[PDB]
A paper describes a structure:
The actin cytoskeleton is a force-generating machinery involved in many processes of eukaryotic cells, such as migration, morphogenesis, cytokinesis, and endocytosis. Actin filaments within actin networks assemble from a pool of globular actin monomers (G-actin), and the polymerization reaction against cellular membranes is one of the physiological mechanisms by which actin networks exert forces. Here, we identify a family of fluorescent nucleotides, N6-(6-Amino)hexyl-ATP derivatives, as a robust tool for studying actin dynamics.
It triggered a clear increase of fluorescence anisotropy, demonstrating that this ATP analog is capable of binding to actin. To further study the mechanism by which ATP-ATTO-488 interacts with actin, we co-crystallized ATP-ATTO-488 actin monomer in complex with an actin-depolymerizing factor homology domain of twinfilin, and solved the structure by molecular replacement. Despite relatively good resolution (2.56 Å) and sufficient space in the crystal to accommodate the ATTO-488 dye, we could reliably model neither the linker nor the dye itself, supporting the idea that the linker is highly flexible, and therefore the dye is not identifiable by X-ray in the crystal. However, we observed some additional electron density in the vicinity of ATP at the distance where the ATTO-488 dye might reside. Importantly, electron density for the ATP part of the ATP-ATTO-488 molecule was clearly visible and resided in an almost identical position as compared to ATP in the previous structure. Together, these data show that the ATP part of ATP-ATTO-488 binds to actin in a very similar manner to unlabeled ATP, and that the dye conjugated to ATP through flexible linker is positioned away from the nucleotide-binding pocket of actin. However, its dissociation rate from actin is approximately three times slower, and this may be due to weak interactions of the fluorescent dye with actin. From a structural point of view this result was somewhat surprising, because there is a potential steric clash between tropomyosin and fluorescent dye on the side of an actin filament.
Numbering used by the authors:
A (entry chain B): 176 to 315
B (entry chain A): 3 to 39, 51 to 375
Write the structure that this text describes.
């Protein structure tokens, strides 16, 4: 169950900006040996560029601002993404990303009042098509 | 380090115990206690069976006999690991559907009988799920005495949906023993059953299509494999190779009311909220020794796909380390410096009592 790794000041500041909608994408990684969550990428990301942000060889955490219409409303929905490409990740890498997930999500809610509307887990970036994001957030 | 964290995966057939930080358990022995007709555990209890009443303290993953379970843990600490448990934090595993009172009992035995400085309890299925690289999915854990279908959502198992099949490696070994015994080759004693268990783990496989494979075996010897027995004799097995693990999909082969592991998976998923069914279908994670059969992931893949809705991506994840994925998962957890503040300490137990395990571990 839940293991809490410290978050870098940088990673925390980028998540603080994403909660204030100043950034639309924050990718985080676990520094496995130092047991820390660090900042990996904060590029401006629209839904069409999102598939091309997901590494192919290593697991990652992503916070993405999903802007879309749903029954007449326009929603800016912060979504959480746990990408795990497969056996390229060691058992230790796979275990740390799974165990560190909940505490990171609790700290982000408790401190930054980020409203994570959905938590998604994917094998690879090519899955993050517009329809897929819509079916995860609004499964009907 | 004289205080290295310990990991004990208490299975109904085998105890996998070791040190946090290692890649594999240092100790693997049978969960058997023999008391005279003061006590014996493991291999020696089985050996002295002529003067003992043998017992399995872990019935279908659940610890049902605590006086006996204490004997297993005592043997684990002093005879297997050769450590004093009062100086090592101990991570323990628990079965799916393990009663909350049972979890409390385990905590009290660790702190009052063994005097451990700290302890942790994790569900076997969740550790295998986490080590696979995800937090939501359905786990098929098939071990020695029990097989479970466990839907897990964000690290929490869904008890209402968990399915239990009381059929696992123990039964498949018995079935292969009977199907070999009746075609000539006669195995009877506990040691001859161990030869059968070895034949089963080395030569058995799951057929993608059972009736097609029965036909291939009837018309040719393409599916035959040989095995040299300890005395030097060579035996050759044909359809027994796949008829034996086929019992997982057709439990009626050994007179069971329970449908196959593909149907109990479908049933388990159908008991959960329609909104999460897609996440379960795309993450069927296998774990346990009885999931080591070649061809089993391919077979589960086609069987789930034949029952599931046609708009579900069906994915079977079968890690190569799945025979020990529970122990390895716990080993990684307990080896972390940041895990130090997750343990239930003796002091926290003395103040709150055993119901601390529901909050601090879950
Ligand atoms: N390669 C293999 N192929 C098939 N079966 C195997 C293989 N390796 C081990 N087994 C069987 O798996 C069983 C042991 O698996 P496991 O350690 O997960 O069980 P357990 O934890 O003791 O039981 P359970 O989870 O049912 O309570 C034995 O019956 C053993 O014969
Ligand atoms: Ca087990």
């Amino acid at each position: 169950q839940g293991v809490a790794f410290p978050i870098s000041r940088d990673a925390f500041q980028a998540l603080e900006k994403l909660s204030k909608k100043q950034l639309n994408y924050v990718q985080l990684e676990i520094d496995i040996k130092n047991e820390t969550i660090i900042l990996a990428n904060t590029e401006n990301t629209e839904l069409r560029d999102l598939p091309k942000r997901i590494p192919k060889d290593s697991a990652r955490y992503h916070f993405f601002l999903y802007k879309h219409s749903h029954e007449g409303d326009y929603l800016e929905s912060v979504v959480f993404i746990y990408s795990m490409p497969g056996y390229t990740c060691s058992i230790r890498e796979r275990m740390l990303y799974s165990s560190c997930k909940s505490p990171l999500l609790e700290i982000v809610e408790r401190q930054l009042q980020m409203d994570v509307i959905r938590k998604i887990e994917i094998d690879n970036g090519d899955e993050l098509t517009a329809d897929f994001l819509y079916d995860e957030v609004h499964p009907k | 380090d004289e205080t290295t964290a310990l990991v004990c995966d208490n299975g109904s057939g085998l105890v996998k115990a070791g040190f946090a930080g290692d890649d594999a358990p240092r100790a693997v022995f049978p969960s058997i206690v023999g008391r005279p007709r003061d006590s014996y555990v493991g291999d020696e209890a089985q050996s002295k069976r002529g003067i003992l009443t043998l017992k399995y303290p872990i019935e279908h993953g659940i610890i049902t006999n605590w006086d006996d379970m204490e004997k297993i843990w005592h043997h684990t600490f002093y005879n297997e690991l050769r450590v004093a448990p009062e100086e090592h934090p101990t991570l323990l595993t628990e079965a799916p559907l393990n009663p909350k009172a049972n979890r409390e009992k385990m905590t009290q035995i660790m702190f009052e009988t063994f005097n451990v400085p700290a302890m942790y309890v994790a569900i076997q299925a969740v550790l295998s799920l986490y080590a696979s690289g995800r937090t939501t999915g359905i786990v098929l854990d098939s071990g020695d005495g029990v097989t479970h279908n466990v839907p897990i959502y964000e690290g929490y198992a869904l008890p209402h949906a968990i399915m239990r099949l009381d059929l696992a490696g123990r039964d498949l070994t018995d079935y292969l023993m009977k199907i070999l015994t009746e075609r000539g080759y006669s195995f009877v004693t506990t040691a001859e059953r161990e030869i059968v268990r070895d034949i089963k783990e080395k030569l058995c496989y799951v057929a993608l299509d059972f009736e097609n494979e029965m036909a291939t075996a009837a018309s040719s010897s393409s599916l035959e494999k040989s095995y040299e027995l300890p005395d030097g004799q060579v035996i050759t097995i044909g359809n027994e190779r796949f008829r034996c693990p086929e019992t997982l999909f057709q439990p009626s082969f050994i007179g069971m009311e329970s449908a196959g592991i593909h149907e109990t998976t479908y049933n388990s998923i159908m008991k959960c909220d329609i909104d999460i069914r897609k996440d379960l279908y795309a993450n069927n994670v296998m774990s346990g020794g009885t999931t080591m059969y070649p061809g089993i992931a391919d077979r589960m893949q086609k069987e789930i796909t034949a029952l599931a809705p046609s708009t579900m991506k069906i994915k079977i994840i079968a890690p190569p380390e799945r025979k020990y994925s529970v122990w390895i998962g716990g080993s990684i957890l307990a080896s972390l410096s940041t895990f130090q503040q997750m343990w239930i300490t003796k002091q926290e137990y003395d103040e709150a009592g055993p119901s601390i395990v529901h909050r601090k571990c879950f």
